[PDB]
Amino acid sequence: VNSFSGYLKLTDNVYIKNADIVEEAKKVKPTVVVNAANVYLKHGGGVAGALNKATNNAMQVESDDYIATNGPLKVGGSCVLSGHNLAKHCLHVVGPNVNKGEDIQLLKSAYENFNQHEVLLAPLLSAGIFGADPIHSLRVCVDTVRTNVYLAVFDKNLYDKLVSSFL
Ligand SMILES: Nc1nnc(SCCn2c(=O)oc3ccccc32)s1
Question: What does the entry report regarding how activity is regulated?
């Protein structure tokens, strides 16, 4: 039993809700919130910009130190950093950005990072400003993640389309 509320159950382990991931994280304080990161951990917009803004830029400050020490992530890769005021940990996961021409096959590799955590609050990887089809992202999520994932979808119209088209 966990404190995630109002989710529709898609499969044994995947749940979905129309919600602002920032507000969901502040309410639930999950062990892990997933960020839709880029390789430079530059949290300018989309989910990343919103999460970072909610931390009063502390996420960006921590991320800049991480990059200065370790260099960029790989597309499909991840790192665990602080969750600040939103969660215990933030799993920064880099899905491919279609608007950069990155290989959509890397989306499965990106979702594999979720399997290192028993429970996560997450957005759909590569959706939004990353340019991929969110219906495809949900399919890859369901077929790749085996741990318990609670997906927050900001756009109500998109949420309804994802549910109604889910096989
Ligand atoms: N594995 C999980 N992580 N985060 C959640 S949600 C937030 C509240 N919370 C809960 O309901 O169960 C919990 C177990 C440990 C820590 C927090 C818990 S479940």
Answer: Inhibited in vitro by GRL-0617.
